[PDB]
């Protein structure tokens, strides 16, 4: 990793890049989620920006996945209750 | 590498000699050495043949001096009560 130019080419604000990559790295580090790109024993920050460069993560997809994996948890709870 | 290597091929049974030593070479305390000399023990090969029970009968030899002798013999790989066949060799019988 040297430059983050295409990670700004795909998220034009350059400040939303930091929020999206921080949210992604916090999901990968403590929450225990797998990286969507195969790593090379990089740290979670570079893996976050490496997922940004592929395009498969931004704030839209992160909100989609948090709503679907919150509805999945509450659906599992409701089907366990009733 | 083959060229550079071809351009350089014109360039490229009484124990052993320790038994024959005097008891003074064992670095024993002045007390232990003088107690052994009083019993006519001159060589390490003479000392190694004596049993612990025989050394305790020697006048003025204490339990402390016996432990010193064992620790020093053990540091050289020797133990009290080894039987040497043909000791002393005829090379020592004339002093």
């Amino acid at each position: 990793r040297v430059t983050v130019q295409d990670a700004v080419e795909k998220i034009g604000n350059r400040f939303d890049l930091v929020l999206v990559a921080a949210r992604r790295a916090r999901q990968m580090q403590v929450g225990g989620k797998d990286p969507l790109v195969p790593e090379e024993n990089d740290k979670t920050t570079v893996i976050a920006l490496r997922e940004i460069e592929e395009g498969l993560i931004n704030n839209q997809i992160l909100d989609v996945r948090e709503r679907q994996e919150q509805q999945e948890q509450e659906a599992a709870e409701l089907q366990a209750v009733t | 590498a083959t060229i550079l290597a071809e351009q350089l091929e014109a360039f490229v049974p009484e124990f052993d000699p320790i038994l024959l030593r005097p008891v003074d070479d064992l670095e024993l305390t002045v007390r232990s050495a003088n107690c052994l000399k009083a019993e006519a023990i001159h060589y390490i090969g003479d000392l190694v043949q004596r049993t612990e029970v025989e050394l305790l009968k020697t006048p003025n030899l204490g339990k402390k001096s016996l432990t010193e002798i064992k620790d020093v013999l053990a540091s050289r790989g020797l133990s009290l009560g080894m039987r040497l066949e043909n000791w002393p060799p005829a090379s020592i019988a004339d002093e």
């Binding site: 430059t3 990670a7 990559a21 740290k43 979670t44 920050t45 920006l49 | -």
Partner: protein, 252 residues
């Protein structure tokens, strides 16, 4: 105790973790820049030379402070806002701040120049690769005018690089420096003598055409080839170099 196993642990945590280097009189924002550490046997911070022109840092006894971004948002701010590759233009204007300062412009000015006779005057060369091969083997000189065949890529279409190859009447050193120029720049950026204003507008035209990543890697290749041929130049200073005018005493 510093046992034998904590240095592998240390090369694990240093990796991909930027640090904030800071010169003590910080006047503008280019005086705090974030780097990645490379571990040093020693007790002195090794600081990349081009970056010195941003810090106003010479090496006459200067000191710098290192700060560690602890949290994760701060590591990302050091990599995405404050990294030294991201600060290549001064915020006061449009001028590049990673301009090559002093040794490297002497190495370039001695490299891309010419003299009216040298070894290999007016011979013809089938590419820049054998220009460097003729300089290294000892058959030509670094400044000896020569027709070469260079292939400059002009990007005249909409994002498509079109190759045009031709014979430029140039020198040996200009072809050797053409081996380092990225694809899109024309050959006439190296065809001149390359002082300091010319190398600054070379990096500026590279940034305006080819963007950021070729300009970072080309700034490094400029610095490496400037240091190497300034070492090969042997450009001393003597007492005879300061030529007194013969007309000076009659003027006085």
């Amino acid at each position: 105790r510093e046992e034998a196993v904590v240095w592998d642990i240390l090369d694990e945590v240093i990796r991909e973790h930027p640090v904030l280097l800071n010169r003590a009189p910080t006047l503008h924002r280019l005086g705090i820049q974030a780097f990645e550490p490379v571990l040093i046997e020693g007790k002195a911070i090794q600081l990349h030379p081009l970056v010195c022109a941003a810090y106003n840092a010479d090496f006459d006894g200067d000191q710098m402070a290192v700060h560690v971004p602890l949290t994760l948002e701060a590591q990302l701010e050091a990599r995405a806002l404050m990294m030294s590759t991201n600060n290549i233009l001064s915020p006061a204007n449009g001028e590049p701040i990673i301009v090559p300062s002093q040794d490297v412009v002497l190495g370039l000015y001695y490299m891309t120049r010419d003299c009216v006779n040298a070894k290999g005057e007016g011979m013809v060369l089938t590419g820049p690769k054998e220009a460097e091969r003729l300089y290294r083997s000892g058959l030509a000189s670094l400044h000896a005018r020569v027709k070469v065949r260079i292939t400059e890529y002009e990007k005249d279409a909409n994002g498509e690089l079109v190759a045009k190859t031709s014979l430029k009447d140039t020198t040996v050193g200009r072809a050797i420096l053409w081996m380092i120029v990225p694809k899109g720049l024309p050959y006439s950026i190296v065809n001149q003598a390359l002082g300091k204003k010319a190398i600054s507008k070379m990096l500026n035209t590279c940034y305006r055409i080819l963007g950021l990543k070729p300009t970072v890697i080309f700034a490094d290749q400029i610095m490496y080839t400037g240091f190497a041929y300034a070492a090969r130049s042997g450009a001393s200073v003597g007492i005879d170099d300061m030529v007194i005018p013969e007309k000076k005493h009659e003027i006085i």
